[PDB]
Write a structure and sequence with these properties.
This is part of a larger assembly, with five copies of chain A. Chain A is 47% helix and 0% strand. Chain A is built from two helices and no strands. Bound molecules: 2-acetamido-2-deoxy-beta-D-glucopyranose (3 copies). Chain A: It comes from Severe acute respiratory syndrome coronavirus 2 (2019-nCoV).
């Protein structure tokens, strides 16, 4: 256009998708333990319990 | 008698191309669902700012138009005829008779008798339609031809009109007439006015549809949103003063 | 980037305002009765 | 004997055209419209009464040259900001430019 | 939709004379000398 510029976002879409996938994997595997420090694995049934 | 001009009388307002934008234009157009005349085949009619004109027959009985202010001598006038294929345009004085026409007996004469100081010359079922607009010294002509099957009935359809010619004069025109070809022993007239329209173009700069804003509340609702489709809801359009 | 130069393009040259029949006419007129031929829509070449 | 009548002007001299140039940054002018940009052929279709194209945002984007009757498209010449990447003068004086 | 509409309105605001003779920096300049074209340029600048 006439002087209008659209900057590209710093985080590209696949990078955000990778963040979301990592969050899903952590939630499924370690429950809420990975949100406070090192991820601690636990069976999913016991996490739901 | 009378008939109703359904959705006809739309012309390209300029030489501009658009791909898919719905462009809103403020110009002179024939209002949608307007009242027009039912001439049979004829008298003289006024020439306020704009006029519409449509003809429909399988036999070429309609030929040319006569324009001017007084339609006599001493006043400049415009003349268009077509004998068989030679389109002739003259912008100059003439002396028209009380019954100007051209028969197809089989004689073909008796339109006028005058020629002096003439400022321009040029030599070149179905539906025919023309729009005549005289502004700021120029004379605009638009045309379109669409095959049909109705005998002498105005059809139901939409078609844009493309500019044909333009000539500079700078004169004032008030009245006009028409010629015919019956024997020697079927046209419409519409009136233009300032309105507001939005047009549709489909990737080829062709007008495929239009909506008259001042017709009904739905039309002005579409005009405000600038779209041919409206979703459920309530919209503010104008004020009651 | 800066434009290299300016370019102008216009349509072809139409009817040429036939001055050739006014400057090379076979016989002009006497001064008390002079012609008044007028020109109209066309392109006039005053350079020539 | 010339004159200026209230009627529109009809007779006057020939406009001097020049050669068109493609794929460069120039200052075009066709029959009054004027600007700058890059001239290139466009795969579009016009109508015999249609001079130039205008897209969304009401910008002149396509024009047909009145010599070959073929459609050309116009795009603005390259414009953009300049950014400087530096590690800090306290560390080094090398500079990267974007 | 809001961002696109605001940007489009900003673009459309360019084609407004703001009470001046024209809305183009060239035609105003090309037909009037600086002493009185400066007022029109100022009006365009203020509006934009
Ligand atoms: C057109 O106007 C005439 C009178 O001027 C009227 O008799 C006729 O009904 C009108 N036609 C329509 C379709 O309203
Ligand atoms: C519009 O153009 C396309 C190609 O650009 C073509 O396929 C289509 O038939 C055209 N529509 C018409 C001519 O009505
Ligand atoms: C900044 O400068 C100070 C003194 O010149 C120096 O001690 C320090 O290490 C520098 N730090 C960096 C990050 O350059």
């Amino acid at each position: 256009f006439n002087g209008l510029t659209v900057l590209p976002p710093l985080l590209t879409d696949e990078m955000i998708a990778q963040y979301t996938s990592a969050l899903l994997a952590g939630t499924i595997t370690s429950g809420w333990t990975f949100g406070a420090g090192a991820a601690l694995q636990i069976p999913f049934a016991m996490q739901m319990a | 008698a009378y008939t109703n001009s359904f959705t006809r009388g739309v012309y390209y307002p300029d030489k501009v191309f658009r791909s898919s934008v719905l462009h809103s234009t403020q110009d002179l157009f024939l209002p949608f669902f307007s009242n027009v005349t039912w001439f049979h085949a004829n008298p003289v009619l006024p020439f306020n700012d704009g006029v519409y004109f449509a003809s429909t027959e399988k036999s070429n009985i309609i030929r040319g138009w006569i324009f001017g202010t007084t339609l006599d001598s001493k006043t400049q006038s415009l003349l268009i005829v077509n004998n068989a294929t030679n389109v002739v345009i003259k912008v100059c004085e003439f002396q028209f008779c009380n019954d100007p026409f051209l028969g197809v007996m089989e004689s073909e004469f008796r339109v006028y008798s005058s020629a002096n100081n003439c400022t321009f010359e040029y030599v070149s079922k179905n539906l025919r339609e023309f729009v005549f607009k005289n502004i700021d010294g120029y004379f605009k002509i638009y045309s379109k031809h669409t095959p049909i099957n109705l005998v002498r009935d105005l059809p139901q359809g939409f078609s844009a009109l493309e500019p044909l010619v333009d000539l500079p004069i700078g004169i004032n025109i008030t009245r006009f007439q028409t010629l015919l070809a019956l024997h020697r022993s079927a046209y419409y007239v519409g009136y233009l006015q300032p309105r507001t329209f939005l047009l549709k173009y489909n990737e080829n700069g062709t007008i495929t549809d239009a909506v008259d804003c001042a017709l009904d509340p739905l039309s002005e609702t579409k005009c405000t949103l600038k779209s041919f489709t409206v979703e459920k809801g309530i919209y503010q359009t104008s004020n009651f003063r | 980037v800066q434009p290299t130069e300016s370019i102008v393009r216009f349509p072809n040259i139409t009817n040429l305002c036939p001055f050739g029949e006014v400057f090379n006419a076979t016989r002009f007129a006497s001064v008390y009765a002079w012609n008044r031929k007028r020109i109209s829509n066309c392109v006039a070449d005053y350079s020539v | 004997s010339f004159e200026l009548l209230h009627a529109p002007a009809t007779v006057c001299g020939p406009k001097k055209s020049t050669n068109l140039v493609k794929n460069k940054c120039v200052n075009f002018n066709f029959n009054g419209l004027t600007g700058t940009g890059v001239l290139t052929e466009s795969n579009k279709k016009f109508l015999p009464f249609q001079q130039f194209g205008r897209d969304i945002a009401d910008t002149t984007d396509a024009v047909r040259d009145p010599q070959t009757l073929e459609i050309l498209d116009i795009t603005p010449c390259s414009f953009g900001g300049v950014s400087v990447i530096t590690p800090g003068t306290n560390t080094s004086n090398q500079v990267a430019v974007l | 939709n809001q961002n696109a509409q605001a940007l489009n309105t900003l673009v459309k605001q360019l084609s407004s004379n703001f009470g001046a003779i024209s809305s183009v920096l060239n035609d105003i300049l090309s037909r009037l000398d600086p002493p009185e074209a400066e007022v029109q340029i100022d009006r365009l600048i203020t509006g934009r």
